[PDB]
Amino acid sequence: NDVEFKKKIYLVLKSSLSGDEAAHKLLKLKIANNLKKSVVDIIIKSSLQESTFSKFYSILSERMITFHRSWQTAYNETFEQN
């Protein structure tokens, strides 16, 4: 339930060559309010795995934060948890 959810988020995140397109797919999923911190955590953990920083994982986070207040509170929680 946690592993298969991480696999679904990773496969959404890992197609979709634009940041806007991954943000479209994840906001189309409409994940519930409790699991938004888990989605943000999977995005950051996937961003760490490459050999460098890329603007993909920045653009998708910006299009998350400007969608709703809940994603911004998820990122304001995830900065402290990181």
Binding site: D20, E21, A23, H24, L27, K28, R63, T66, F67
Partner: peptide, 15 residues
């Protein structure tokens, strides 16, 4: 076009 042509609004583009 070799697609379906299914077009949809972008939820990441509301701003």
């Amino acid at each position: 076009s070799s697609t379906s042509g299914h077009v949809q609004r972008s939820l990441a583009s509301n701003n």
